[PDB]
Amino acid sequence: EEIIWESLSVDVGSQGNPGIVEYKGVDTKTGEVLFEREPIPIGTNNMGEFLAIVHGLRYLKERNSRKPIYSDSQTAIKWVKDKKAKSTLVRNEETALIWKLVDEAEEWLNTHTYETPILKWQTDKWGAIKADY
RNA sequence: UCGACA
DNA sequence: ATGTCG
Ligand SMILES: [Cl-]
Ligand SMILES: [Mg+2]
Ligand SMILES: [Mg+2]
C-alpha cells in the first residue's frame, strides 16, 4: 500500500511487439536514469521486462544495495521468481540477440544469489511506473 | 469462455 | 494488434 520510494524501478520500452526492445532503470524517488539497454532489433515486451529486472538485480548486487525493485510486469516478476523466461518468441537468426540476452540473464540467475524483493508496481493506484517510456 | 498484467 | 499468466 505504501510506495517504497527508496527503490529501483525498471521498465521496458518498445517499437512494435515483437519489435525493437530496450529497457531502463531509474531511482523511484527522483526519476534519475541509472541504466539503459541499447535497443535490441527484435524482442518481446515480456522478454524486455524480464531483462530489465535481472539487470536491476545485477546492478544492485554490484553496489551492495538491498533496495527492492519495482516492475509493473506480472509476467516478468514470475519469470524471475522461477528463474525461467517462458517466452513464446520463435528462436531463429533474427531473434538470436534477444534470446542470447534472455538465456544469459537466466544463466546469471541460476548461478548467483540475492535477497532483493521484486515488487509489483500498483499502476492502477500509483500511476505509471517511473521508468515508463 | 474469459479475467488480469503489460 | 501481440506477449503472457491466472
Ligand atoms: Cl540484458
Ligand atoms: Mg511495463
Ligand atoms: Mg511502460
Residues 6+ apart with CB under 8 A from A24: A10, A11, A13, A33, A34, A35, A36, A37, A52, A131, A133
Q: Which three cell numbers stand for residue A36?
A: 539503459
Are A97 and A44 spatial neighbours (Cβ–Cβ below 8 Å)?
Answer: no
Separation between the CA of A67 and the C1’ of B6 (whole angstroms): 23
CATH number of the domain that A127 lies in?
3.30.420.10
Structure's resolution in angstroms: 1.6
Cell of A40: 535490441
Q: How far apart are CA A41 and CA A74, in angstroms?
A: 24
Residue A133 to residue A22: CA distance in whole angstroms: 10
Owning domain of residue A29: 1-133
The amino acid present at A43, given as its one-letter code, is G
How remote is the CA of residue A105 from the centroid of ligand 1, in Å?
7
Distance CA A66, CA A36 (A): 20
CB A45 within 8 A of CB A96: no
- A13 Cα to the center of ligand 3, angstroms: 6
| C-alpha closest to that of A26 among A128, A130, A117, A122 | A130
Interatomic CA distance for residues A117 and A86, integer angstroms = 21
DSSP A39: P
- Count of structural domains within chain A: 1
Parallel/antiparallel/unpaired status of strands A8-16 and A33-36: unpaired
**Site of grid cell 499502476:** A123
Buried b (16+ CB within 10 A) or exposed e, A9-34: bbbbbbeeebeebbbbbbbbeeeeeb
